[PDB]
Amino acid sequence: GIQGLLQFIKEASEPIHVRKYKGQVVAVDTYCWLHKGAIACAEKLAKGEPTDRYVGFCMKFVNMLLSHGIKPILVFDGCTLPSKKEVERSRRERRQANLLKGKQLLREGKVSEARECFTRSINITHAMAHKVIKAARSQGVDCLVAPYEADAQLAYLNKAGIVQAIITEDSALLAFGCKKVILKMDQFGNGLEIDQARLGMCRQLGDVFTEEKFRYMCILSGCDYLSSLRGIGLAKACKVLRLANNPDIVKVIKKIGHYLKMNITVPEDYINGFIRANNTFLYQLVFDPIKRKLIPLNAYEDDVDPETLSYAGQYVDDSIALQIALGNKDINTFEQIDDYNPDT
DNA sequence: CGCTAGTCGACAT
DNA sequence: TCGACTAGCG
Ligand SMILES: [Mn+2]
Ligand SMILES: [Mn+2]
Ligand SMILES: [Mn+2]
Ligand SMILES: [Mn+2]
Ligand code: NA
Numbered sequence: 122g123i124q125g126l127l128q129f130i131k132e133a134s135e136p137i138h139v140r141k142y143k144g145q146v147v148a149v150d151t152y153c154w155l156h157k158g159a160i161a162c163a164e165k166l167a168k169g170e171p172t173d174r175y176v177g178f179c180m181k182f183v184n185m186l187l188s189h190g191i192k193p194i195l196v197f198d199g200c201t202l203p204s205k206k207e208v209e210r211s212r213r214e215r216r217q218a219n220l221l222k223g224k225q226l227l228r229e230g231k232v233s234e235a236r237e238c239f240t241r242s243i244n245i246t247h248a249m250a251h252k253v254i255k256a257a258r259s260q261g262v263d264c265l266v267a268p269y270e271a272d273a274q275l276a277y278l279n280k281a282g283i284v285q286a287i288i289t290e291d292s293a294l295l296a297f298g299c300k301k302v303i304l305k306m307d308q309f310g311n312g313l314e315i316d317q318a319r320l321g322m323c324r325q326l327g328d329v330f331t332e333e334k335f336r337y338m339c340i341l342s343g344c345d346y347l348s349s350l351r352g353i354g355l356a357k358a359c360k361v362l363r364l365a366n367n368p369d370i371v372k373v374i375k376k377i378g379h380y381l382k383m384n385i386t387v388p389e390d391y392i393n394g395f396i397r398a399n400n401t402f403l404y405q406l407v408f409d410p411i412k413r414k415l416i417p418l419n420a421y422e423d424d425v426d427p428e429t430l431s432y433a434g435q436y437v438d439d440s441i442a443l444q445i446a447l448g449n450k451d452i453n454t455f456e457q458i459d460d461y462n463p464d465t
Numbered sequence: 466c467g468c469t470a471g472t473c474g475a476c477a478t
Numbered sequence: 479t480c481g482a483c484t485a486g487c488g
Contacts, residue, residue: 125468127481152479153475161476178476198479212479240476245479271479290475290480305481352488354468 122208122345126292127304129355130315132323139303139310142286143190147303148278150271150289151195151253152245154179159243167220167239179253181308183262189310194284195257196274197250197266199445200452203432204346204401205270216242247452251459254448258461265410266448269434272297273405273418280418283410286314295320296339296402297418298332325356327363334362336402337370346398350377350385357381371396397432400425406434408446415442 127134139147158175165172186193201209223238254264267274276297278284286301287294294302295317306312320330329338341358343349349358364380365373371392378385404417404425415436421427437445444450444457451458 122480124481150479154479156479157475159476160474163476174476237473241473292481349468352468356467 122291123293123296123339123342123355125342125355126295126339127315129359130292130295130320130323130326133319133321134304134313134315135319137303137312137314139186139191139288139306139312140189141314145285146192146194146283147186147286147288148194148196148275148284149182150275150287150291150294151179151250152198152271153290154182155245155250155253156243159245159249160240163240163243164236166244167223167242173252175249176252176256180256180260183257183260185308185310187260187262193262194278195253195262195264196271196278197247197254197264197448198269198271199267200269200434202269202401202405202434204397204405207348208345216244248458251448264448265408266446268406268408268415268437268442268445270405274407275299277407277409277416277418281409288312293339293344296336296344297405298336298402326359329359329362336399338362340395340398340402341374344398346401347394350387350391352383352385353377370399400430401433404430404433406436408442410446413443413446414439 155175158178159166161178162172162174183193219238220242223235223242226235226238257264265274272291272294275287275289275294276299279287279299279301286303287299288303288306290304292302292304295315298317300317302315304313304315320326320335323330329335338355338358340347341349341353341361342355343353361373361377361380367373374392374395375387377387403419404421406415407418408414409416417427441450445452447461447463449457449459449461
């Protein structure tokens with residue numbers, strides 16, 4: 122959701138081929154592939170007609186990784202995150218709008234236009250993802266459903282040393298503190314890598330290459346958890362953090378118009394939103410696959426009360442988190458759609 | 466120049 | 479699940 126982030130830090134990126142990670146473990150932001158896969162068969166998906174074309178699309182990529190001796194872990198988005206509800210609403214509204222329009226264009230005969238609308242009405246469901254999971258597993262590929270956003274789960278797997286890199290199209294994964302992200306990776310393995318440790322290569326960040334400041338910059342520029350103040354993008358957010366001296370980020374935001382020589386009113390709820398968004402990048406719940414439990418992405422500090430962090434994912438019993446992670450529990454019916462047992 | 470909001474692009478015949 | 483582009487605005 123950090124619009125314009127990749128161009129802005131392009132200096133820190135390197136063209137690569139995934140051969141680099143041969144014999145290592147890479148995690149995949151699989152909903153990216155799913156959304157790409159679904160475009161080919163949008164019409165049938167919109168009409169409710171049966172399709173599994175998207176499964177073969179994802180499997181091309183999976184197969185390619187395996188051929189180069191990469192051990193992929195496919196990660197899937199799970200339950201809805203309240204911090205993202207506004208964005209979830211606008212996406213839902215847009216899908217609905219386009220689906221209706223396509224249908225009306227079918228009673229018109231304009232199949233060309235109707236196709237353009239359907240393709241923008243695509244909704245990726247757990248049922249669709251679960252078909253990819255079965256395909257993957259049958260080829261011995263580890264799959265994991267995040268309890269909430271795949272984003273934080275990926276970050277967690279990268280930070281824990283479980284995977285060495287993350288394949289995704291979402292550059293905001295860097296604000297979650299991923300070490301290595303591989304973007305724009307094509308079907309042949311060519312892609313664009315950004316390492317957190319090379320963010321200092323990026324001249325226009327100044328000293329906003331440190332984890333905490335980089336996160337603040339991303340949030341300030343406007344992210345999925347929190348719309349920016351009007352007139353603030355990456356460059357001005359970066360500028361505020363460069364020029365600001367005070368460590369207390371709240372006191373800096375309150376006087377943000379000062380650092381920028383702009384008339385910017387900062388509403389009281391914006392500070393609250395900013396804190397919430399910060400806490401969401403930091404403490405969004407993930408599933409530790411080794412101990413098989415729900416944990417915050419980072420350990421709680423001595424400044425956060427975990428009781429107040431519902432918006433970052435509510436805890437559920439670990440036995441339930443397990444069934445979700447294995448893909449057994451449908452997200453929504455919360456009923457068993459499968460009974461895969463990794464032990465046996 | 467930097468930011469915004471709208472648009473449109475991803476598939477693959 | 480997202481990103482790239484662009485014309486217009488300050
Ligand atoms: Mn849940
Ligand atoms: Mn979703
Ligand atoms: Mn994201
Ligand atoms: Mn995501
Ligand atoms: Na912004």
